[PDB]
Amino acid sequence: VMNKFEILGVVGEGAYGVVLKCRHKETHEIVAIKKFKVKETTLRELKMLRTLKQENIVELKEAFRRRGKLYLVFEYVEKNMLELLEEMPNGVPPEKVKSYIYQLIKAIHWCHKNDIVHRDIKPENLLISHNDVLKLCDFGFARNLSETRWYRSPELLLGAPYGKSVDMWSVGCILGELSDGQPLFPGESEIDQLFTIQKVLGPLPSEQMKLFYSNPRFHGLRFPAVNHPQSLERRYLGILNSVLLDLMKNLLKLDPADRYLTEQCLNHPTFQTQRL
Ligand SMILES: N#CCc1ccc(Nc2nccc(Nc3cc(C4CCCC4)n[nH]3)n2)cc1
């Protein structure tokens, strides 16, 4: 309990709840304890965490209860990518961009090999250790395939069926943001998110446009048609080199069927080239 764990400070508080940085009084291990302000989502996530146990996935260590309140004890990692971008608001060095995107793709590759899509990859849930080791967490929106809006693919925004390609979109968004510090698609609403995406990449594919009208969620709403699209080439000139730009264009294909999945990404020149 807080019998056994000393509270060192507050890591975060939000919609997720509250995460405390704590220390075991007997062993002196430092941990992250998530306290809740039990639901199906929690049980689903714990199952996935066990399946995915690995050095690039946050470890759940134990669960306990104090007077009916659930506490989950995790591995503690010193920071997340969101905090890192606050410290470096104009982006990180190109070497660190490649290392974090490599590691993210490797972690997603492991999820996908286990038939799990994460569906909510964003800087806030990418933990980065003192040794620069990236780890994934926050599996509450994840799905097993056999059964805030800024990083979501257009097909997920529209309510379409989805597969492994959903996570590759998020990778492309993070590649850009690590390079210049700026969120690539900062929409203000679901509709404005679709607008912001097309403002860069041009009109959505035919099937997605049809989904806007067949999905009753958008009944009577105005489709956000784009005027003069900008292009990734224009958006990232002087930010991305041609090799990273090439990779980014193939992560951010509007049609999920055209996106590179993880194995193809790892065969890309971005990761296969060796500094001389
Ligand atoms: N819940 C959730 C997602 C989330 C992820 C990160 C943060 N913020 C943050 N900010 C700085 C460090 C940090 N370290 C950390 C978090 C965890 C857990 C994953 C699971 C809950 C403890 N272990 N080590 N987390 C806040 C929320």
Ligand code: NA
């Ligand atoms: Na750490």
